[PDB]
Recover the amino acids of this structure.
RNA sequence: AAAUAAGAAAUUA
């Protein structure tokens, strides 16, 4: 994970497998359907809201 | 085996000898323990009100 | 992540059609290909057989060719596209770069700076956007331009 | 209790800290017992917290009564709890009227509450009690 | 009780309240009538 | 039905003895349930079976409870009685499955495996294209091509 | 839900809200109260109507 | 006739006001429009009336029902930046080695993913496999939706890992990760025998046996 | 031929 945070593709040239970014993280980024992250579903946001405004205790 | 009778079942080493004791049987359902504890405690108090 | 069978069952005592068991070269395995492998009947060992049909390594090789065909077939049914060879000038801004051949470098992102990260390899272009480029001779456009959806328009899903 | 020999400010400092502590305890314990629908047991534990907080010349804060009232299930418990909270403010000889419907005795409170006699709303002890009443309504 | 007891001993185990530790227990019970004596035909 | 050939019948008890491996394999049991549910009929025997077997599986690695010796033999006989009950609860199921499957196949214009009864359609076992030219159990000669149980339109 | 009722009740509540307290004597305290906030505030008149 | 859209009960009214107030603070995922907010409020109230129904049906069902160092509590080993914890499962000593990366999801949409694919697909929708991967979140009294997981296969790869042994290994990986993340959660887990590792293997291949494993060849008296 | 990542349970010298 640390390697991947500081990864840049331009630095990878001339290195073997050391030049490859961390498999999972990189492939996850390359995926487009991943790029859209769902909002915190209505039931959830309502539930939390009710507990911290109506009932005076945060979840 | 060969032209001789099979050994009785107890003459073989334990079939599950390699499975740990915590797996046979699994004690699952731990989540509920605390719940029922509270419950029972609560019930006890109920059963005093009847009496007293 | 396929559930299908990729391995030929090992030779053993004769399997028979049972609950829970079928013959080895039964017609229901490998989409009926097992025909190719089958010696029918109560085979008389001494006098008859075709040796390769009982051989584990040979049989498994055949099955593997068949699986390969299945995959190839499905990968080609999966294409909606042709590769066209278009001169460097006329190609969209994203391909104006250098594009390493397959398995040569790290799988490559189309345009990190514009927020598109996807394999340039698998990016597919619409025959309608490349019209001016691909059929310059034709004058009038052969394909009518794509109609696109206004995502700012008030429509049934916006609750108006 | 067993120390009368200390300076007064010491005794009051430590009494303040102790009340703080009992209240944090009561809250924490309501949160523990509420999701299990424990009502009788919870009510007892509150009875003990209240009892210990009165010898100390204070009570359960309105705050913990709010958090409590929102977790109650039976109606009986809800009203009896508002009742308790009221009685917690006044001593036991205080003037009160009986609701025969609920078989309860509501103390007249306002005589005791702090009142200012420029003035913010925060000076009345009524802003406090109404909070609990409100919580009961909701 | 000791907070230690309620941290470590408040779970189901072969000590506390074990689920049946033995094979061949009664899985399924229902209220039913008795069958006739020897309902099975001796055969072949 | 794709599996058409003559087959070997196994006694019900040995089929049941396969436990989780086949008779109670979750996958199989679920599509039995699907068949019943779709026909609009409760699956009680399946559910009894699933209960018994579920629990069989859960305790399958434990040793049986310690036996104290009795002249009565009441314990041994009660264990036995319970056991044959369960066996019968499952026979009933096994029967139901073969029953309904044959019936449903009759509705779907399906041809069964060789030498198999379908109550309304083929009373004696249905056969076509066997390795052996006669019907095996009638000892009567088979027609070419394979006999048809259903009228032609599809 | 009760039609034979809720007028009497909305009424009752509005009395309480206009008075500001149910205490019998009318204190200077209650007056200072009425100066600080508005008990008969738009929410209660609105919902009364 | 017509129905009214506007809130029916006092309950609806109160929740509707809440939703408005949330919309004005611009919190993520809250409906901007009043119609959506109505639908939301109605749906919520209905959900709570359902919950009350299930609780009642439970209370009624309950009456007609038929019948020394303890455990090692550790500190949390977690990546301070990514907030990830790492466990490993095994079964068959070789065949299945898995590694779970487990991290907390604050949005409450958690998901489990195996080798880049959603858990449903990987275990082939078979429930009796996937519930094994649910179990550690149960035993620990946790909501699985508060956690994101990715499992990594370090053993022998195969096109399908849906089968009970592989699932056993999975469950174990997840449980070990969970323990590194929430230390105290170790005590329920250890008691329910999740963390416990069974050592079993297919017999090594060996040419003496017919099938290559268990079956000795034919014997004849001289 | 088999109680060994499988799934079997009660008649010792």
């Amino acid at each position: 994970m640390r390697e991947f945070a500081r990864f840049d593709p331009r630095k990878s040239r001339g290195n073997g497998q050391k030049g490859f970014p961390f498999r999972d993280a990189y492939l996850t980024k390359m995926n487009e359907a991943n790029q859209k992250t769902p909002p915190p579903t209505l039931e959830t946001i309502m539930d939390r809201a009710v507990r911290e405004h109506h009932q005076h205790a945060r979840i | 085996r060969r032209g001789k009778p099979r050994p009785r079942a107890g003459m073989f080493p334990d079939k599950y000898r390699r499975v740990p004791m915590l797996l046979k049987p699994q004690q699952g359902g731990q989540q509920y323990f605390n719940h029922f504890l509270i419950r029972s405690t609560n019930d006890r108090l109920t059963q005093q009100d009847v009496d007293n | 992540v396929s559930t299908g069978e990729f391995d030929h069952p090992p030779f053993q005592f004769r399997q028979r059609h049972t609950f829970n068991t079928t013959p080895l070269h039964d017609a229901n395995r490998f989409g009926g290909r097992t025909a190719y492998l089958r010696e029918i009947g109560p085979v008389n060992i001494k006098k008859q057989g075709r040796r390769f049909k009982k051989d584990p390594r040979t049989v498994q090789f055949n099955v593997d060719v068949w699986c390969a065909q299945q995959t190839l077939r499905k990968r080609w049914k999966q294409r909606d596209w042709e590769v066209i060879e278009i001169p460097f000038r006329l190609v969209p801004r994203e391909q104006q770069r250098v594009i390493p051949e397959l398995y040569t470098d790290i799988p490559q992102m189309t345009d990190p700076a514009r927020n598109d990260f996807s394999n340039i390899r698998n990016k597919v272009y619409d025959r309608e956007e490349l019209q001016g480029v691909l059929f310059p001779a034709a004058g009038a456009m052969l394909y009518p331009p794509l109609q696109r959806v206004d995502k700012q328009a008030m429509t049934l899903d916006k609750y108006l | 209790s067993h120390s009368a020999s200390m300076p007064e400010e010491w005794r009051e400092a430590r009494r303040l800290q102790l009340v703080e502590l009992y209240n944090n305890l009561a809250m924490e314990e309501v949160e523990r017992l509420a999701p299990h629908r424990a009502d009788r047991l919870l009510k007892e534990q509150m009875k003990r917290f209240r009892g210990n907080l009165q010898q100390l010349g204070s009570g359960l804060r309105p705050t913990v009564y709010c958090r409590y009232l929102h977790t109650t299930h039976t109606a009986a418990v809800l009203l009896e709890e508002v009742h308790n909270f009221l009685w917690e403010l006044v001593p036991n000889d205080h003037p009160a009227m009986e609701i025969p419907a609920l078989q309860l005795r509501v103390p007249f409170v306002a005589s005791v509450l702090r009142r200012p006699s420029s003035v913010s709303r925060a000076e009345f002890g009524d802003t406090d009690v109404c909070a609990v009443f409100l919580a009961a309504a909701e | 009780t000791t907070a230690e007891h309620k941290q470590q001993d408040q779970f189901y185990s072969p000590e506390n309240q074990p689920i049946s530790l033995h094979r061949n227990n009664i899985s399924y019970m229902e209220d039913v009538g008795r069958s006739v004596k020897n309902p099975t035909v001796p055969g072949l | 039905n794709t599996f058409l050939t003559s087959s070997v019948a196994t006694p019900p008890i040995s089929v049941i003895r396969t436990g989780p491996k086949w008779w109670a394999d979750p996958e199989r049991m679920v599509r039995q349930k699907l068949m019943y549910f779709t026909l609009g009929v409760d699956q009680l025997p399946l559910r009894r079976t699933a209960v018994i077997q579920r629990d069989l599986q859960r305790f399958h690695m434990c040793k049986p409870p310690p036996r104290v010796g009795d002249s009565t033999g009441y314990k041994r006989s009660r264990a036995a009685q319970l056991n044959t009950w369960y066996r019968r609860i499952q026979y009933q199921e096994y029967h139901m499955q073969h029953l309904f499957t044959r019936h449903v196949w009759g509705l779907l214009r399906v041809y069964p495996g060789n030498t198999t009864k379908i109550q309304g359609k083929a009373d004696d076992g249905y056969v076509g294209y066997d390795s052996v030219p006669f019907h095996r159990y009638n000892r009567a000669p088979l027609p070419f091509p394979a006999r048809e149980l259903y009228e032609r339109r599809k | 839900n009760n039609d034979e009722t809720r007028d009497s009740d909305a009424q009752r509540v509005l009395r309480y809200a206009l008075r500001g307290s149910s205490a019998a004597q009318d204190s200077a305290s209650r007056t200072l109260w009425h100066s600080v906030e508005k008990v008969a505030d738009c929410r209660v008149v609105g919902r009364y109507i | 006739m017509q129905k009214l859209l506007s809130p029916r009960t006092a309950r609806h009214a109160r929740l509707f006001r809440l939703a408005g107030k949330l919309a004005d603070s611009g919190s993520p995922g809250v409906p901007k429009s009043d119609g959506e907010r109505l639908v939301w409020v109605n749906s919520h109230v209905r959900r709570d009336k359902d919950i009350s129904l299930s609780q009642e049906e439970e209370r009624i069902r309950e009456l007609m029902m038929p019948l020394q160092i303890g455990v090692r509590i550790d500190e949390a080993e977690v990546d301070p930046e990514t907030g990830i914890a790492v466990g490993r499962g095994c079964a068959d000593g070789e065949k299945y080695h898995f590694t779970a990366l487990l991290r907390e999801n604050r949005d409450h949409n958690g998901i489990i993913t195996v080798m880049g694919k959603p858990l449903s697909l990987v275990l082939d929708n078979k429930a009796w496999l996937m519930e094994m991967v649910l179990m550690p979140f149960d035993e620990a009294n946790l909501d699985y939706r508060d956690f994101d997981a990715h499992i990594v296969s370090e053993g022998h790869a195969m096109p399908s890992i849906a089968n009970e042994i592989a699932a056993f290994a999975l469950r174990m990986a997840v449980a070990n990760a969970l323990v590194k993340l929430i230390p105290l959660t170790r005590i329920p887990l250890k008691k329910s025998g999740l963390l416990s590792v069974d050592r079993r293997r297919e017999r090594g291949q060996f040419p003496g046996y017919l099938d290559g494993k268990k079956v000795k060849r034919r014997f004849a008296k001289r």
Notes: The radius of gyration of chain A is 20 Å.
